[PDB]
């Protein structure tokens, strides 16, 4: 049945019920819709249910290229042999490329501004327009692929279209791995902690299982606590001068029309560099733009992302908080006194026990994001353990890890080591002043430099290879 149009507990639904004291939803028979995740290999019925991962577990830029062959070809520009990704044929952003449009039945982007009639963008992953901030990243990386294939053609005029696409794709996968492991993970975990728990790369291990685990798909939603209530857009002087510079997120979900008609991706990229993230605090976890107004412009009711995350771990048959603490070699608090020490917060521990009775039953996302943050990190110990486990596997179990001997040449690894997300912005946008340490909060003009000061990717090591 259509879980958006009934609150009955009929297949494949698992509706989120409304409490009597709800501060927002006052219809006691309403629900927040919820479709269960599809089961893997549905033929066997007496087996324990598992959920599917539709994407490649490797950090390989599959969100740009696709994880299915037919989709990966659909994203390519098939009108020439330049090895490019297809671009929007109707709109451009100050002369620069935009993503092609998708062709969805009941396209949600069309519902965000009925008169603009701008559908969702098409990229390697189905969620590319969940915000215009995420669509801006997808657009930026599609441009970087085309810039790489264009420069590789200049160096290698006899390479065919497939070789140009394959080589640009291989460089892009390495850049995504470098930005992730060198820049992002040390700031999630703490720099010393990332060095100690991930360690230096020692080579490929064919006995490592690189698959993404079911629990990681819930734990890595810790990011939801870092959203501010607005999408921030800034002009070329990094000022919120336009009259709609602070867009509430609940009017920006799926709003591809904002990229097409409200200034392209540069104001969005500038907003991301120059605005601080929200800090996860135990008494300020998730903004109401996500906890109460999620997707309100495209669904019959504003959803609650925290409720979806907790219902989703139940849907996915995940063990509770203490089972995951035990998996990580952490203590299993059994009562109020112990939970108060683990959370460094008696009032929060009391609220958890009033709701759950035992910490054994706390749903993984809420218990994990409630842990106090480790010094230098944006995670407590449980999320640090789970993320270290997943990212260690994704690196050590990947036969195409960028540092593995034979994947790239020594000269190519040296050239790749100079890349940065700031350089990708400089190379593919009209922005000429960027933050150098892009993931740190930089209050403009502090930490911002001209693009000429940011190292470049020298592609000479790809000539004649």
């Amino acid at each position: 049945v259509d879980c958006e149009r009934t609150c009955a507990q009929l297949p494949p639904c698992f509706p989120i019920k409304i409490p009597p004291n709800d501060p927002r939803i006052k219809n006691q028979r309403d629900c927040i819709p919820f479709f269960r995740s599809a089961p893997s290999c549905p033929q066997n019925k007496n087996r324990v249910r598992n959920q599917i991962n539709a994407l490649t577990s490797f950090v390989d830029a599959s969100m740009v290229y696709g994880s299915e062959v037919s989709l990966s070809l659909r994203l390519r520009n098939r009108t020439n042999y330049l090895g490019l990704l297809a671009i929007n044929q109707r709109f451009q952003d100050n002369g620069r490329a935009l993503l092609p449009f998708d062709n969805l039945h009941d396209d949600p982007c069309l519902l965000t501004n009925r008169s603009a009639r701008i559908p969702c963008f098409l990229a390697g992953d189905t969620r590319s327009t969940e915000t215009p901030k995420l669509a801006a990243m997808h657009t930026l990386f599609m441009r970087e692929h085309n810039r790489l294939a264009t420069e590789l053609r200049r160096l290698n005029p006899r390479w065919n279209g497939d070789k140009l696409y394959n080589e640009a794709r291989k460089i892009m996968g390495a850049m995504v791995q470098i930005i992730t492991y060198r820049d992002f993970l040390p700031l999630v975990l703490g720099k010393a902690r990332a060095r100690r728990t991930l360690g230096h790369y020692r080579g490929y291990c064919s006995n490592v299982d690189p698959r993404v685990a079911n629990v990681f798909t819930l734990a890595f939603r810790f990011g939801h606590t870092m959203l501010q209530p607005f999408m921030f857009r800034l002009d070329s002087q990094y000022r919120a001068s336009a009259p709609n510079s602070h867009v509430p997120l609940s009017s920006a979900f799926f709003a591809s029309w904002r990229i097409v008609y409200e200034g392209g991706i540069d104001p969005i990229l500038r907003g991301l560099m120059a605005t601080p993230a929200k800090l996860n605090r135990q008494d300020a976890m998730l903004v109401d733009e996500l906890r109460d107004r999620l997707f309100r412009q495209v669904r019959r009711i504003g959803l609650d992302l925290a409720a979806l995350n907790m219902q989703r771990s139940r849907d996915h048959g995940l063990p509770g908080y203490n089972a995951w603490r035990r998996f990580c070699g952490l203590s299993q608090p059994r009562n109020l006194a112990q939970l108060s020490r683990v959370l460094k917060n008696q009032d929060l521990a009391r609220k958890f026990l009033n709701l759950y009775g035992t910490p054994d039953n706390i749903d993984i996302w809420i218990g994990a994001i409630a842990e106090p943050l480790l010094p230098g990190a944006r995670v407590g110990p449980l999320l640090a353990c789970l993320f270290e486990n997943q990212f260690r596997r994704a690196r050590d179990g990947d036969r195409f890890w960028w540092q593995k001997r034979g994947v790239f040449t020594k000269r190519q690894r040296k050239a790749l080591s100079r890349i940065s997300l700031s350089r990708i912005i400089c190379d593919n946008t009209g922005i000429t002043t960027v933050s150098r340490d892009i993931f740190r909060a930089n209050i403009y003009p502090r930490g911002f430099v001209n693009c000429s000061r940011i190292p470049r990717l020298n592609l000479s090591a790809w000539r004649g290879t």
């Binding site: 539709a54 994407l55 996968g173 870092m226 609220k351 759950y356 740190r440």
Partner: protein, 104 residues
């Protein structure tokens, strides 16, 4: 024969002895055994009266209302991280995993 120069699109052939490891369209790995109300597929919370470890489960929306919800005066910006840090996290999450929903 798996290639030694380029990745496949689907991730197949990254592990030569177990070619589907890490490939798309497969079951998510489990780091611990699954826990369902009936031991097979019904989620905990499916039957309101079915206890987990001897206790009734709260409504996920009640947990959200009582613990997650907060007023504007407590919103705190992170002095050490830009929104670009958050955005890289969503973007890399979309390189790693997506569980499709069951259709209507």
């Amino acid at each position: 024969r798996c290639s030694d120069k380029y990745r496949t699109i689907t991730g197949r052939c990254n592990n030569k002895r177990r070619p589907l490891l890490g490939a798309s369209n497969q079951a998510l790995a489990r780091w611990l055994p699954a826990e369902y109300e009936d031991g097979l597929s019904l989620p905990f919370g499916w039957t309101p009266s079915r206890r987990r470890n001897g206790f009734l489960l709260p409504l996920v929306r009640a947990v959200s209302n009582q613990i997650v919800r907060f007023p504007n005066e407590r919103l705190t910006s992170d002095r050490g991280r830009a929104l670009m840090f958050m955005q890289w996290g969503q973007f890399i999450d979309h390189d790693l995993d997506f569980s499709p929903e069951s259709p209507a």
